[PDB]
Amino acid sequence: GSRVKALEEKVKALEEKVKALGGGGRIEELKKKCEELKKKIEELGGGGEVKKVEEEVKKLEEEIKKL
Numbered sequence: 001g002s003r004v005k006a007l008e009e010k011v012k013a014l015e016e017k018v019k020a021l022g023g024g025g026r027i028e029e030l031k032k033k034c035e036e037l038k039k040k041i042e043e044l045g046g047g048g049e050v051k052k053v054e055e056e057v058k059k060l061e062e063e064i065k066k067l
């Protein structure tokens with residue numbers, strides 16, 4: 001990857017972690033935002049708005065880091 005091509009591979013692996021987890025609370029909020037985030041990347045193009053969705057992936061990533 002380089003920019004966008006690498007983005008899709010980042011969240012895709014991000015799911016294998018949650019899907020393997022369990023319990024409510026922090027896992028709940030991270031779930032709804034997890035999938036909705038992906039579909040947002042499909043609508044995106046090459047640049048511009050790609051910066052916004054990028055921040056959406058940065059929030060859920062750092063989140064699971066603690067839980």
Ligand SMILES: *Sc1ccccc1O
Nearest residue numbers: 014015018019034035
């Ligand atoms: S990131 C993630 C976790 C669990 C289910 C779906 C997802 O996209």
